Amino acid sequence: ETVCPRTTQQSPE
Amino acid sequence: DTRPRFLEQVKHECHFFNGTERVRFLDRYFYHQEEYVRFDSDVGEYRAVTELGRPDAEYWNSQKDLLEQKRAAVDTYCRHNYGVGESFTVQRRVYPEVTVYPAKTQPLQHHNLLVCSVNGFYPGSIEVRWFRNGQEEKTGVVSTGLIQNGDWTFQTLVMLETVPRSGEVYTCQVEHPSLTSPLTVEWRA
Amino acid sequence: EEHVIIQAEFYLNPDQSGEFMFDFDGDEIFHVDMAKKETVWRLEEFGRFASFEAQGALANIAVDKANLEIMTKRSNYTPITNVPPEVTVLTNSPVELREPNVLICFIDKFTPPVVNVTWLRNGKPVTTGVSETVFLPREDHLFRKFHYLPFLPSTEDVYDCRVEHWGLDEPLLKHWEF
Ligand SMILES: *[C@@H]1O[C@H](CO)[C@@H](O)[C@H](O)[C@H]1NC(C)=O
Ligand SMILES: *[C@@H]1O[C@H](CO)[C@@H](O)[C@H](O)[C@H]1NC(C)=O
């Protein structure tokens, strides 16, 4: 009953 | 305002074939409109699409816990969310509404268009055909294409270029996934 | 395929605008309001069967902003080429007089996702009962949007949707009359 999000990754600085 | 802009998009996509029997997960990243790095569930690792995204594929693929959570997304994310909204998305079916009325290409001249207005249906795939006295008319038919109203409905206007004569019966046939038989509407002068 | 569910996000500099939304087969399931931090379902019936935690969405926008500043340096500050939109005006249902209907202004195939659009009646602006969708993603990775205007068709009135975009050299007006 709850939608799950998918995670955005962080680029190397 | 004339300042330059810089856009960054991310698209987490789940692709489904035959229910959830086959699922594809894509983790795409864009600078403006150019994709530069993605994760493809059929490959199991990040791959750089342009030279610009090479630092990201190298850095992300070194992390074990990241690749593993990206490889389970077909089940932890794609198949999970499918069953959540399967009721009101996958199985949403709205009956079409067919109206037939005449129109004109240039004003102040007799009717020369038979417009079949199919309205408010879902899903989008539709097959609309014209008939004249029982014979299908495939010559001189123009349309708007399939229009997405943006509110989870579609519409299309399939127009017939013809000057109707008295005693002619024109029929607009509409086929749709949610229909058991072809829906037809007759129009006579 | 059979169906596609897309979780689309974007962040735009220097406007500092972001957006989080779910896409199904080209239709919007819901979007997270970045301001009030709330889930906005495209149709009220959706929120009954499904829930979404709006707090999780704001994390991706933070990473999106950080990524953008990394990519802007990488591209030596190469700005985005503005793509002007196509505009079309249609009615949701076939027109009858004194029978309620809805005008739809369809702004498609544009980037960046910034646009001024206005409904006009006989030349004067209208903001009564006007609704609009948030910026919807495409598959060529431009954008598209919808504006709605409930109205009563009459012989006396005339309607335009004027769209403004940095890729247009003049405000594009799209006409509708009965
Ligand atoms: C950006 O600048 C770097 C450093 O001068 C250079 O190597 C690169 O070719 C330039 N262009 C792009 C598209 O990265
Ligand atoms: C919206 O109107 C404001 C008025 O100053 C303008 O700065 C902005 O650029 C307009 N939208 C466009 C065409 O981007």
Taking the domains of chain C in order of start, what are their residue ranges? 1-79, 80-178
List of chain A residues whose C-beta atoms are within 8 Å of the C-beta of residue C72: none
Q: Which two tokens stand for residue C64?
A: 């999106």
Q: Which class in CATH covers the domain with range C80-178?
A: mainly beta
Q: At what angle do helices B64-71 and B54-61 cross, to 10 degrees?
A: 90
| C1-79 shares its CATH topology with C80-178 | no
Return d(Cα C136, Cα C68) in angstroms, integer. Answer: 20
Return d(Cα B56, Cα B40) in angstroms, integer. Answer: 14
B77:A12 CB<8 A: no
Beta bridge partners of B135: B132
Q: Which two tokens stand for residue C33?
A: 């309001």
Return d(Cα C113, Cα C165) in angstroms, integer. Answer: 9
Encode B164-187: b = buried (16+ Cβ within 10 Å), e = exposed: beeeeebbbbbebeeeeeebeeeb
SS3 state at C39: strand
8 Å CB contact between B185 and B131 = no
β-strands C101-110, B45-48 pairing: unpaired
Bond into C113 cis (ω within 30): no
SS3 state at C175: strand
- Cα–Cα separations (whole angstroms), residue B40 to C11, C122, C142, C173: 23, 52, 22, 42
What is the nearest CA distance from C86 to chain B, expressed in angstroms?
Answer: 14
Minimal Cα distance from C56: which residue of A?
A5
The amino acid at B156: T
8 Å CB contact between B38 and B26 = yes
In order, the DSSP letters of chain B are -----EEEEEEEEEEEETTTTEEEEEEEEEETTEEEEEEETTTTEEEESSGGGHHHHHHHHT-HHHHHHHHSHIIIIIHHHHHHHIIIIIT--B--EEEEEEE-SSSSS---EEEEEEEEEBSS--EEEEEETTEE--SSEEE---EE-SSS-EEEEEEEE--PPTT-EEEEEEE-TT-SS-EEEEEE-
CA nearest to C92, candidates B88, B148, B184, B185 = B148
Is the alpha carbon torsion for B69, B70, B72, B73 positive or negative? positive
CB atoms within 10 A of CB C144: 20
Q: Does the beta carbon of A10 lie under 8 angstroms from any beta carbon of chain B?
A: no
CA C132 vs. chain centroid, Å, equals 7
A3:B73 CB<8 A: no
Residue with tokens 């207005």: B117
CA C100 vs. chain centroid, Å, equals 24
List of chain C residues whose C-beta atoms are within 8 Å of the C-beta of residue B150: 27-28, 104, 106, 133, 136, 146, 148
Q: Which structural technique was applied? A: X-ray
Under DSSP, the state recorded for C113 is S
Q: Which of C117, C145, C163, C164 to mutate to test the pocket of ligand 2 (most atoms within 8 A of CB)?
A: C164
Give the B window 160-179 contacts with C, CB below 8 Å: none
Minimal Cα distance from A9: which residue of B?
B60
Return d(Cα C137, Cα B73) in angstroms, integer. Answer: 22
8 Å CB contact between B55 and A12 = yes
Q: Which two tokens stand for residue B158?
A: 């399939």
Q: Is B47 annotated as a binding residue?
A: no
Alpha helices (runs of H) in chain C, residue ranges in sequence order: 46-49, 54-74
8 Å CB contact between C172 and C162 = yes
- Cα–Cα separations (whole angstroms), residue C105 to B61, B149, B165, C148: 44, 10, 36, 6
The amino acid at B73: A
CA torsion C27-A9-B81-B8 (nearest 10°) is 0
Return d(Cα A9, Cα B12) in angstroms, integer. Answer: 11
8 Å CB contact between B120 and B156 = no
- C1-79 CATH fold: 3.10.320
Under DSSP, the state recorded for C75 is T
Q: Is B5 annotated as a binding residue?
A: no
Return d(Cα B114, Cα B130) in angstroms, integer. Answer: 9
What is the nearest CA distance from A1 to chain C, expressed in angstroms?
Answer: 5
8 Å CB contact between B70 and B60 = no
SS3 state at C38: strand
Return d(Cα C94, Cα B159) in angstroms, integer. Answer: 14
8 Å CB contact between C60 and C47 = no
Ordered by where they begin, the domains of chain B are: 1-90 (3.10.320.10), 91-189 (2.60.40.10)
